[PDB]
Amino acid sequence: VATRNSIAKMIAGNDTESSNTPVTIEKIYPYYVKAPSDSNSKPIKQLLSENNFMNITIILFRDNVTKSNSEWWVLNLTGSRIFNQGSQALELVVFND
Ligand SMILES: *[C@@H]1O[C@H](CO)[C@@H](O)[C@H](O)[C@H]1NC(C)=O
């Protein structure tokens, strides 16, 4: 309920005080996914179980320097940094078959 309330306040941003903070959700985004030769791909729970703390941050970016209402979303995976740190980005480890 807290995450839903926060994202509601953000998408209906009318305060210019809040909505500048990325809202975090837990237990969402796996890291290690195997892509077999078939159609089905499998998120490996052996190498990393999805029952642990997995952070995913969100925030709605917008601006008027474009002189228009052209907004978009942006995600972030800053906790548990991997090589090529590059804050405010995502990374997926895939096991090809
Ligand atoms: C923003 O919209 C919500 C929708 O009800 C309202 O509760 C809130 O008071 C509004 N805030 C401002 C600053 O307009």
PDB file of C-alpha atoms and ligand atoms in Angstrom:
ATOM      1  CA  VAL A   1       0.000   0.000   0.000  1.00  0.00           C
ATOM      2  CA  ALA A   2       2.888   2.383   0.724  1.00  0.00           C
ATOM      3  CA  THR A   3       4.481   1.848  -2.691  1.00  0.00           C
ATOM      4  CA  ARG A   4       1.107   2.327  -4.387  1.00  0.00           C
ATOM      5  CA  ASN A   5       0.477   5.529  -2.425  1.00  0.00           C
ATOM      6  CA  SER A   6       3.919   6.883  -3.324  1.00  0.00           C
ATOM      7  CA  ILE A   7       3.616   6.103  -7.031  1.00  0.00           C
ATOM      8  CA  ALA A   8       0.140   7.650  -6.997  1.00  0.00           C
ATOM      9  CA  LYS A   9       1.464  10.829  -5.543  1.00  0.00           C
ATOM     10  CA  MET A  10       4.192  10.820  -8.205  1.00  0.00           C
ATOM     11  CA  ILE A  11       2.100  10.116 -11.319  1.00  0.00           C
ATOM     12  CA  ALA A  12      -0.319  12.804 -10.092  1.00  0.00           C
ATOM     13  CA  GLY A  13       2.594  15.095  -9.229  1.00  0.00           C
ATOM     14  CA  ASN A  14       1.170  18.471  -8.228  1.00  0.00           C
ATOM     15  CA  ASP A  15       3.405  19.466  -5.292  1.00  0.00           C
ATOM     16  CA  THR A  16       6.921  20.254  -6.692  1.00  0.00           C
ATOM     17  CA  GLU A  17       8.246  19.166  -3.273  1.00  0.00           C
ATOM     18  CA  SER A  18       7.791  15.390  -3.326  1.00  0.00           C
ATOM     19  CA  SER A  19       8.070  13.263  -6.511  1.00  0.00           C
ATOM     20  CA  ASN A  20      11.802  14.100  -6.643  1.00  0.00           C
ATOM     21  CA  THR A  21      12.557  10.861  -4.769  1.00  0.00           C
ATOM     22  CA  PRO A  22      12.734   7.518  -6.615  1.00  0.00           C
ATOM     23  CA  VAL A  23      10.300   4.991  -5.168  1.00  0.00           C
ATOM     24  CA  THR A  24      11.760   1.583  -4.343  1.00  0.00           C
ATOM     25  CA  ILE A  25      10.122  -1.824  -4.734  1.00  0.00           C
ATOM     26  CA  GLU A  26      11.475  -5.102  -3.392  1.00  0.00           C
ATOM     27  CA  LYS A  27      11.811  -8.658  -4.724  1.00  0.00           C
ATOM     28  CA  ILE A  28      11.286  -7.842  -8.394  1.00  0.00           C
ATOM     29  CA  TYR A  29      14.241  -8.059 -10.751  1.00  0.00           C
ATOM     30  CA  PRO A  30      16.355 -11.240 -10.981  1.00  0.00           C
ATOM     31  CA  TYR A  31      19.977 -11.088 -12.102  1.00  0.00           C
ATOM     32  CA  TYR A  32      20.714 -14.538 -13.542  1.00  0.00           C
ATOM     33  CA  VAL A  33      18.462 -15.832 -16.324  1.00  0.00           C
ATOM     34  CA  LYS A  34      19.217 -18.792 -18.588  1.00  0.00           C
ATOM     35  CA  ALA A  35      18.139 -18.646 -22.246  1.00  0.00           C
ATOM     36  CA  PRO A  36      17.854 -22.228 -23.549  1.00  0.00           C
ATOM     37  CA  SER A  37      17.714 -22.995 -27.266  1.00  0.00           C
ATOM     38  CA  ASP A  38      13.923 -23.378 -26.972  1.00  0.00           C
ATOM     39  CA  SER A  39      11.410 -20.557 -26.504  1.00  0.00           C
ATOM     40  CA  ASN A  40      11.204 -20.714 -22.706  1.00  0.00           C
ATOM     41  CA  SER A  41      13.763 -18.744 -20.692  1.00  0.00           C
ATOM     42  CA  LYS A  42      14.191 -19.458 -16.996  1.00  0.00           C
ATOM     43  CA  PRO A  43      15.079 -17.035 -14.167  1.00  0.00           C
ATOM     44  CA  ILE A  44      17.527 -19.126 -12.158  1.00  0.00           C
ATOM     45  CA  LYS A  45      16.674 -19.338  -8.462  1.00  0.00           C
ATOM     46  CA  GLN A  46      19.646 -21.642  -7.812  1.00  0.00           C
ATOM     47  CA  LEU A  47      22.328 -19.032  -8.507  1.00  0.00           C
ATOM     48  CA  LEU A  48      20.237 -16.304  -6.845  1.00  0.00           C
ATOM     49  CA  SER A  49      16.866 -16.926  -5.204  1.00  0.00           C
ATOM     50  CA  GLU A  50      14.163 -14.286  -5.640  1.00  0.00           C
ATOM     51  CA  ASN A  51      13.344 -14.541  -1.913  1.00  0.00           C
ATOM     52  CA  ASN A  52      16.045 -12.033  -0.895  1.00  0.00           C
ATOM     53  CA  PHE A  53      16.214  -8.235  -0.887  1.00  0.00           C
ATOM     54  CA  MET A  54      16.101  -7.139  -4.545  1.00  0.00           C
ATOM     55  CA  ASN A  55      15.838  -3.378  -5.036  1.00  0.00           C
ATOM     56  CA  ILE A  56      14.302  -1.635  -8.046  1.00  0.00           C
ATOM     57  CA  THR A  57      13.976   2.156  -8.055  1.00  0.00           C
ATOM     58  CA  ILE A  58      11.574   4.164 -10.221  1.00  0.00           C
ATOM     59  CA  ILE A  59      10.942   7.838 -10.905  1.00  0.00           C
ATOM     60  CA  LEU A  60       9.002   9.863 -13.478  1.00  0.00           C
ATOM     61  CA  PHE A  61      11.292  12.249 -15.349  1.00  0.00           C
ATOM     62  CA  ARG A  62       9.824  15.289 -17.090  1.00  0.00           C
ATOM     63  CA  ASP A  63      10.896  18.788 -18.067  1.00  0.00           C
ATOM     64  CA  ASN A  64       9.877  22.015 -19.768  1.00  0.00           C
ATOM     65  CA  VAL A  65      13.222  22.932 -21.361  1.00  0.00           C
ATOM     66  CA  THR A  66      11.723  21.078 -24.335  1.00  0.00           C
ATOM     67  CA  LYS A  67       8.782  23.531 -24.090  1.00  0.00           C
ATOM     68  CA  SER A  68       6.323  20.627 -24.100  1.00  0.00           C
ATOM     69  CA  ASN A  69       4.766  18.000 -21.844  1.00  0.00           C
ATOM     70  CA  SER A  70       6.964  15.113 -22.973  1.00  0.00           C
ATOM     71  CA  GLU A  71       7.548  12.963 -19.885  1.00  0.00           C
ATOM     72  CA  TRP A  72       8.951   9.465 -19.457  1.00  0.00           C
ATOM     73  CA  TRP A  73       9.849   6.947 -16.759  1.00  0.00           C
ATOM     74  CA  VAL A  74      13.311   5.941 -15.580  1.00  0.00           C
ATOM     75  CA  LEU A  75      14.379   2.922 -13.531  1.00  0.00           C
ATOM     76  CA  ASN A  76      17.465   2.433 -11.395  1.00  0.00           C
ATOM     77  CA  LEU A  77      19.471  -0.441  -9.924  1.00  0.00           C
ATOM     78  CA  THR A  78      22.078   1.228  -7.707  1.00  0.00           C
ATOM     79  CA  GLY A  79      22.173  -1.171  -4.762  1.00  0.00           C
ATOM     80  CA  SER A  80      24.253  -4.310  -5.299  1.00  0.00           C
ATOM     81  CA  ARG A  81      26.498  -2.651  -7.863  1.00  0.00           C
ATOM     82  CA  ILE A  82      28.219  -4.769 -10.514  1.00  0.00           C
ATOM     83  CA  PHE A  83      31.140  -3.958 -12.830  1.00  0.00           C
ATOM     84  CA  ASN A  84      30.743  -0.877 -15.023  1.00  0.00           C
ATOM     85  CA  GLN A  85      29.065   0.803 -12.073  1.00  0.00           C
ATOM     86  CA  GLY A  86      27.222   3.500 -14.024  1.00  0.00           C
ATOM     87  CA  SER A  87      24.615   4.571 -11.475  1.00  0.00           C
ATOM     88  CA  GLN A  88      20.993   4.846 -12.630  1.00  0.00           C
ATOM     89  CA  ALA A  89      21.087   1.835 -14.951  1.00  0.00           C
ATOM     90  CA  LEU A  90      20.119  -1.836 -15.193  1.00  0.00           C
ATOM     91  CA  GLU A  91      22.085  -5.025 -15.782  1.00  0.00           C
ATOM     92  CA  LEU A  92      21.003  -8.582 -16.613  1.00  0.00           C
ATOM     93  CA  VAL A  93      23.279 -11.628 -16.469  1.00  0.00           C
ATOM     94  CA  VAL A  94      22.195 -14.194 -19.065  1.00  0.00           C
ATOM     95  CA  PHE A  95      23.373 -17.804 -19.365  1.00  0.00           C
ATOM     96  CA  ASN A  96      23.280 -18.700 -23.034  1.00  0.00           C
ATOM     97  CA  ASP A  97      22.864 -22.360 -23.950  1.00  0.00           C
TER      98      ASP A  97
HETATM   99  C1  LIG B   1      -2.694  16.826  -5.652  1.00  0.00           C
HETATM  100  O1  LIG B   1      -3.819  15.936  -6.103  1.00  0.00           O
HETATM  101  C2  LIG B   1      -4.376  15.136  -5.000  1.00  0.00           C
HETATM  102  C3  LIG B   1      -5.550  14.336  -5.533  1.00  0.00           C
HETATM  103  O2  LIG B   1      -6.595  14.422  -4.566  1.00  0.00           O
HETATM  104  C4  LIG B   1      -4.804  16.015  -3.824  1.00  0.00           C
HETATM  105  O3  LIG B   1      -5.206  15.177  -2.735  1.00  0.00           O
HETATM  106  C5  LIG B   1      -3.695  16.912  -3.370  1.00  0.00           C
HETATM  107  O4  LIG B   1      -4.189  17.791  -2.354  1.00  0.00           O
HETATM  108  C6  LIG B   1      -3.166  17.737  -4.531  1.00  0.00           C
HETATM  109  N1  LIG B   1      -2.073  18.581  -4.090  1.00  0.00           N
HETATM  110  C7  LIG B   1      -1.852  19.774  -4.633  1.00  0.00           C
HETATM  111  C8  LIG B   1      -0.648  20.503  -4.116  1.00  0.00           C
HETATM  112  O5  LIG B   1      -2.579  20.245  -5.493  1.00  0.00           O
END
